[PDB]
Amino acid sequence: LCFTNVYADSFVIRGDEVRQIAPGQTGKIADYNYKLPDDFTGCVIAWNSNNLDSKVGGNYNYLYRLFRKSNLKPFERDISTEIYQAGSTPCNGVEGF
Amino acid sequence: KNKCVNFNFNGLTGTGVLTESNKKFLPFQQFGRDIADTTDAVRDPQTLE
Amino acid sequence: VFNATRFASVYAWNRKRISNCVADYSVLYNSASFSTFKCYGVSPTKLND
Amino acid sequence: QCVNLTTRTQLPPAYTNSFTRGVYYPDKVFRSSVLHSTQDLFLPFFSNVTWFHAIHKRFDNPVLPFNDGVYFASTEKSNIIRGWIFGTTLDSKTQSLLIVNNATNVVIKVCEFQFCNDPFLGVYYHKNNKSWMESEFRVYSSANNCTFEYVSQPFLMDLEGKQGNFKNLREFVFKNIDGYFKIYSKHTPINLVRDLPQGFSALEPLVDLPIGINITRFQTLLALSSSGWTAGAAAYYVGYLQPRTFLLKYNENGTITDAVDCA
Ligand SMILES: *[C@@H]1O[C@H](CO)[C@@H](O[C@@H]2O[C@H](CO)[C@@H](O[C@H]3O[C@H](CO)[C@@H](O)[C@H](O)[C@@H]3O)[C@H](O)[C@H]2NC(C)=O)[C@H](O)[C@H]1NC(C)=O
Ligand SMILES: *[C@@H]1O[C@H](CO)[C@@H](O[C@@H]2O[C@H](CO)[C@@H](O)[C@H](O)[C@H]2NC(C)=O)[C@H](O)[C@H]1NC(C)=O
Ligand SMILES: *[C@@H]1O[C@H](CO)[C@@H](O[C@@H]2O[C@H](CO)[C@@H](O)[C@H](O)[C@H]2NC(C)=O)[C@H](O)[C@H]1NC(C)=O
Ligand SMILES: *[C@@H]1O[C@H](CO)[C@@H](O[C@@H]2O[C@H](CO)[C@@H](O)[C@H](O)[C@H]2NC(C)=O)[C@H](O)[C@H]1NC(C)=O
Ligand SMILES: *[C@@H]1O[C@H](CO)[C@@H](O)[C@H](O)[C@H]1NC(C)=O
After folding, report:
1. Other C-beta atoms within 10 Å of A25: how many?
2. Are D244 and D263 in contact (CB under 8 A)?
3. DSSP three-state, residue C44
4. Which sign, positive or negative, has the C-alpha torsion D8, D9, D12, D18?
5. D117 and D3 Cβ atoms separated by less than 8 Å
6. Cβ contact (<8 Å) for B28 and D32?
7. Could you say which of A24, A27, A31 has the minimum Cβ distance to residue C43?
8. To 5 degrees, how large is the angle CA A58–CA A63–CA A66?
9. How far is the CA of D216 from the centre of ligand 1 (A)?
């Protein structure tokens, strides 16, 4: 079989969250940083990389998004670092309650 | 051409007689489909005819 | 539910009634880390609606 | 740079009729001698395509909504319409897509742009050299976090002309579906003065960009001391695509030759 346009999406996640990479899933990976479309045509590939990515003092170069006003769209990539407001108050600057 | 063969164009497996067409595919198109929606024409991927 | 200091043995499995509350399951994303989460009567996406 | 060019006359919003335009090939399959029904985001027939002018006096570059795709067309002379900006903040809080055709090459880039209130490009008109050459590029201040970047092979496209009636119609359909930004386009010669020509012609797909950004608003970029200038005689029209069934006639050669809007 041949393929017309091919894109490889490469990223690192916690091992528990590989299940969230399937289309039609929820959780902070599916909800907030990586969503696959319901009619996704492709394959998902993952392998345990503890021997490559881990660091004795803890490797903190790998980031995930924990807060979002709304679940993002399929194949959408949110780079924004703007602060998330959990309460009813607005929050400016860098930090707040 | 002109003989019955099990063809495979870009994975488009099938059985049928191949023949030189006069359909003019615009470049973004590779396959043509019938009223029955069965693929009836194909652009050969090595010699673009 | 998901943080109780001591869970029950499987033969004596516990059952708790959940009533008059809002199912905002987002609150536990930071700290849950579920290895298995499988729904059988609903799609997981729909739980909020 | 980044400069506000505020000298312009105020006019009310214009509208015109999208008779039989904004139809595109719905898929890359060939079909001939058949009438094909398809449901997609099409520009409804005989809808109001909002209408904008560049004159001398008037230089209309508003930030416009971008919902369920957009149909964009420009009756153009002397290459005044040169690109678009897409995004949802246009202030570097979030990413944005820039498509620009400038004198030397077309550039497509996705960055956290800090756009200006009035973005534009500029040309020096007949400055003792007989030819026209581009000199001003004032759209954004800085473009730090870029995640997509394409630049075409170089060329020189002329930026001079003073003929009365418009000689070019360029049509574009923009759809942002599941992270893929799709563009369909068509080019036809015309000899019309002041309105979207009546007729029919379907847009072929040309490029599909995997930008993956959230697009809610967009803005076209037009060629143009800091304030007080002269606008080019060019006009562009904007419609919006809605999910509609379209019956499409394919002629003996496979080109969509007619269409019917089911609603
Ligand atoms: C893609 O970008 C869209 C535009 O930014 C965005 O829609 C925006 O959503 C926010 C939050 O839902 C809205 O913010 C306002 O919402 C209501 C009024 O709509 C107010 O009560 C709030 O206090 C707040 O002021 C924006 O108004 C809204 N913008 C538009 C044009 O609708 C989408 O949510 C984004 N898509 C994704 C998947 O993130
Ligand atoms: C696919 O490969 C063939 C060669 O294997 C290329 O076709 C050749 O083109 C030259 C120039 O016309 C001919 O002299 C050869 O005889 C052709 N080969 C054969 C086997 O007939 C062809 O160009 C390749 N595909 C593409 C898209 O370039
Ligand atoms: C062009 O005008 C806009 C307003 O129309 C200016 O934007 C303002 O910028 C100041 C800071 O410089 C902010 O405090 C205001 O809130 C902004 N207003 C709006 C409506 O956005 C912009 O700075 C001007 N640019 C130049 C180069 O003069
Ligand atoms: C988005 O832009 C910001 C601002 O440049 C980036 O934050 C910088 O990241 C580099 C690399 O880690 C640091 O050396 C700088 O100190 C950071 N600057 C600030 C002001 O925090 C951020 O990394 C960019 N994001 C992406 C995805 O490229
Ligand atoms: C005329 O062209 C030359 C290069 O050919 C350029 O350096 C010069 O600035 C131009 N003059 C004007 C007035 O634009």
Report:
1. 19
2. yes
3. helix
4. negative
5. no
6. no
7. A24
8. 120
9. 9
Determine whether the shortest distance from the Cβ of D129 to ligand 5 is under 6 A.
yes
Residue A5 has φ and ψ, to the nearest 5°, of: -135, 130
State in Å: Cα D6 to ligand 3 middle: 12
Render D184-235 in DSSP notation, one character per residue. EEEEEEEEESSS------PBEEEEEE-------EEEEEEB---S-----SEE
Residue with tokens 């050669």, as numbered in its chain: D253
CB A94 within 8 A of CB A83: yes
Q: Which helix (H) or strand (E) holds A31?
A: helix A28-32
Report the residue from A16, A24, A28 with minimal CB separation from C45.
A24
User: Is A72 touching ligand 1 by the criterion CB < 6 Å?
Assistant: yes
CA A21-A27-A33 angle, to 5 degrees, is: 65
> What is the C-alpha separation between D151 and D144, in angstroms, rounded?
17
Task: Give the binding-site residues of ligand 2, using a 6 Å CB cut-off.
Answer: B 46-47
Q: Please tell me the experimental approach by which this structure was elucidated.
A: cryo-EM
How far are the Cα atoms of A84, D111, D143 from residue D96, in angstroms, in the given order? Answer: 21, 6, 10
Ligand 5, atom 14: nearest CA belongs to which residue? D127
Resolution, expressed in angstroms to one decimal: 2.9
Distances (CA, A) of A52 to A8, A12, A44, A45, D249: 20, 11, 20, 17, 57
Q: The tokens 């990389």 sit on which residue? A: A49
